[PDB]
Design an enzyme around this catalytic site. Structure first.
Site, short mmCIF file in Angstrom:
data_model
loop_
_atom_site.label_atom_id
_atom_site.label_comp_id
_atom_site.label_asym_id
_atom_site.label_seq_id
_atom_site.Cartn_x
_atom_site.Cartn_y
_atom_site.Cartn_z
N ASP B 125 0.71 -1.28 -0.04
CA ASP B 125 0.07 -0.04 0.01
C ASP B 125 0.90 1.27 0.08
O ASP B 125 0.65 1.99 0.91
CB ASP B 125 -1.05 0.00 1.35
CG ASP B 125 -2.25 0.65 1.06
OD1 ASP B 125 -2.42 0.79 -0.15
OD2 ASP B 125 -2.85 1.10 1.82
N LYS B 127 1.66 4.65 -1.05
CA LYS B 127 1.18 5.99 -1.48
C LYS B 127 1.61 7.05 -0.97
O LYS B 127 2.06 6.92 0.21
CB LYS B 127 -0.52 5.86 -1.63
CG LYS B 127 -0.86 4.88 -0.23
CD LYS B 127 -2.21 5.62 0.01
CE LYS B 127 -3.28 4.56 0.21
NZ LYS B 127 -4.68 5.21 0.57
N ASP B 143 2.54 2.54 7.91
CA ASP B 143 1.29 1.92 7.70
C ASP B 143 1.39 0.46 7.09
O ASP B 143 1.38 0.21 6.03
CB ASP B 143 0.44 2.70 6.48
CG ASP B 143 -1.00 2.50 6.87
OD1 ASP B 143 -1.49 1.21 7.46
OD2 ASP B 143 -1.75 3.61 6.85
#
Ligand SMILES: CCn1cnc2c(Nc3cccc(Cl)c3)nc(N[C@@H]3CCCC[C@@H]3N)nc21
EC number: 2.7.11.22
Lengths: 261, 296
Positions: B125, B127, B143
């Site tokens: 993920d 980003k 994260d």
């Protein structure tokens, strides 16, 4: 790229290190007052059954067993609670490793309402506290799948037979708790190679591992005997499992009478 | 443990839980608390983040400091960072980001990603909202809710992965297996985004995303990507768009940057550059670590 050429060697080195840090105490069962190697043998066999019923990965089973041995290496448990520990371990393993873990309620169902949902969930938390969340442990399978990349021509009966022998070692604490995952996986690979093709542990894995046929001899002797005695063993769920076409019916292959070692 | 922390303000909501800024009363340290409420026991999302982050110590991965297990809640204590990259890009919308800072941040993200991949971990993920930055000039991977320990070779993992705009073609076309290359794709979309301050492939669905990628890089065939014609979600009726010059995809970028970006967005996951090899690319010949140009 699915075999990650730029990273496989760093990853092998890392797993060798972690293998030593996640090791259970070799002689934990004598200091457990209420339970025995026979009782843990029954529990592991039950987990194999649960894994076939809910169609879980084999990695899931190997991890659960690692969590159980570590937890019992520091916590006394009565015979009436050994199954509660084992159920929480399998829930934790499935949450870590499975795309679609079964729900908590199905882990209560497979215990025949011996325990409540409240109990399972609290045992989950205690296992986490005891292991300090260190759940990404190396397993026999993690080494075995790397070793499989050194085959002249890849061979499916070799691969399934090594998996089966590796899995057999999980049942018997005495004496597989004294051998590291990477060693058991090396014995199981050599033994499957010999049984099927007549070949031996290749120079290329001597190069990767540092392990020779001479340093593998002790574990390779115990594992030979386990294979020979498997049709007579009190627990049979693994032999039954590896009759399936999924694993090329390899539990039907006859062991060799002798090793030449 | 929990009585020594003084809550300061809310920061916002992540993949799971909620994030607060706080202060250690005895020590002075400013930290970021992730509060997770305890249906099903401990979520697999937290089991993975906690276990994998305990193993990973690197200067470009966010540092997990403590886990406080109050049996009714779970609190994760983390080092505090001042902003994420997404917010910093909005603060630089007029003006731009200076090239030495883009270079520094791309270099550090590759170091962190190389370290994840060497320890058997796939991010999943990547980003700008998940990349945190400080006052001294550092950027860090954060994260790890969607992260996952992989084996060699890889098995089939979860399909519903990576935010749409940063998702690699092999995931979009439904391949059985994906590997480390998936994180490099994302990092390439981000490099383009730092230069431009707008997303490189902002699709509204799986099919529109695919079409935007094909429009910029060319519809792939069997010569540029062996096997693509047999993938589960490949359709012969896809339009065949011509590939445009990369000098037109990111006009301000020098010849070296274009080299690196093309290598990070290669169609074929087997030919896509690794984080480890990308660290040696001529783009980073003159690299430094300056502090950000604005306040955080
Ligand atoms: C848990 C690890 N961690 C350390 N420092 C963090 C963080 N820092 C700030 C502080 C002030 C503004 C912003 Cl955008 C991020 N944000 C942060 N996450 C928030 C959650 C939603 C808002 C954007 C950002 N990704 N996580 C942080």
């Amino acid at each position: 790229v699915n075999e990650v050429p730029d990273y496989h060697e760093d990853i092998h080195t890392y797993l060798r290190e972690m293998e030593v840090k996640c090791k259970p105490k070799v002689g934990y069962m004598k200091k457990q007052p209420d339970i025995t190697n026979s009782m843990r043998a029954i529990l592991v066999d039950w987990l194999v059954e649960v894994g076939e019923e809910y169609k879980l990965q084999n990695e899931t089973l190997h991890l659960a067993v690692n969590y159980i041995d570590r937890f019992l290496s520091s916590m006394s448990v009565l015979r009436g609670k050994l199954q509660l520990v084992g159920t929480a371990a399998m829930l934790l393993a499935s949450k870590f490793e499975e795309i679609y873990p079964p729900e908590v309620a199905e882990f209560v169902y497979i215990t025949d309402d011996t325990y409540t949902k409240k109990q399972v969930l609290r045992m989950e938390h205690l296992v986490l506290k005891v292991l300090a969340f260190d759940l990404a442990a190396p397993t026999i399978n993690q080494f075995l799948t790397q070793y499989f990349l050194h085959q002249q021509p890849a061979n499916c009966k070799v691969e399934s037979l090594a998996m089966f022998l590796g899995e057999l070692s999980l049942i018997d604490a005495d004496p597989y708790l004294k051998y590291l995952p990477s060693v058991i996986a090396a014995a199981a690979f050599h033994l499957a190679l010999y049984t099927v093709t007549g070949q031996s542990w290749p120079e290329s894995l001597v190069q990767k591992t540092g392990y020779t046929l001479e340093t593998l001899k002790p574990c390779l002797l115990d594992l030979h005997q386990t294979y020979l005695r498997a049709p007579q063993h009190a627990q049979q769920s693994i032999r039954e499992k590896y009759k399936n076409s999924k694993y090329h019916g390899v539990s039907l292959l006859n062991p060799p009478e002798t090793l030449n070692v | 443990s929990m009585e020594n922390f003084q809550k300061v303000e809310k920061i916002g909501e992540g993949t799971y839980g909620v994030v607060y800024k706080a202060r250690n009363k005895l020590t002075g340290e400013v930290v970021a608390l992730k509060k997770i409420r305890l249906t099903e026991g401990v979520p697999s999302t937290a089991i993975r983040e906690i276990s994998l982050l305990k193993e990973l110590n690197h200067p470009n991965i966010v540092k997990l400091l403590d886990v406080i297990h109050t049996e009714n809640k779970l609190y994760l204590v983390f080092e505090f960072l001042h902003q994420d990259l997404k917010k910093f890009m909005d603060a630089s919308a007029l003006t731009g980001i200076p090239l030495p800072l883009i270079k520094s941040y791309l270099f550090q993200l590759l170091q962190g990603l190389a370290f994840c991949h060497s320890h058997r971990v796939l991010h999943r993920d990547l980003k700008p909202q998940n990349l945190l930055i400080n006052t001294e000039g550092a950027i860090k991977l954060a994260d790890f809710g969607l992260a996952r320990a992989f084996g060699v070779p890889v098995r089939t993992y979860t399909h519903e992965v990576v935010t749409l705009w940063y998702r690699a073609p092999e995931i979009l076309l439904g391949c059985k297996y994906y590997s480390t290359a998936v994180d490099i794709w994302s990092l390439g979309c981000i490099f383009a985004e730092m230069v431009t301050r707008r997303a490189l492939f902002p699709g509204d669905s799986e099919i529109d995303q695919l079409f935007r990628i094909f429009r910029t890089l060319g519809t792939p065939d069997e010569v540029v990507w062996p096997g693509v014609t047999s993938m589960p979600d490949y359709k012969p009726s896809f339009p065949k768009w011509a590939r445009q010059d990369f000098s037109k995809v990111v006009p301000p970028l020098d010849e070296d940057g274009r080299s690196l970006l093309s290598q990070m967005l290669h169609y074929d996951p087997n030919k896509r550059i690794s984080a480890k090899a990308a660290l040696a690319h001529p783009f980073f010949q003159d690299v430094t670590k300056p502090v950000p140009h604005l306040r955080l």
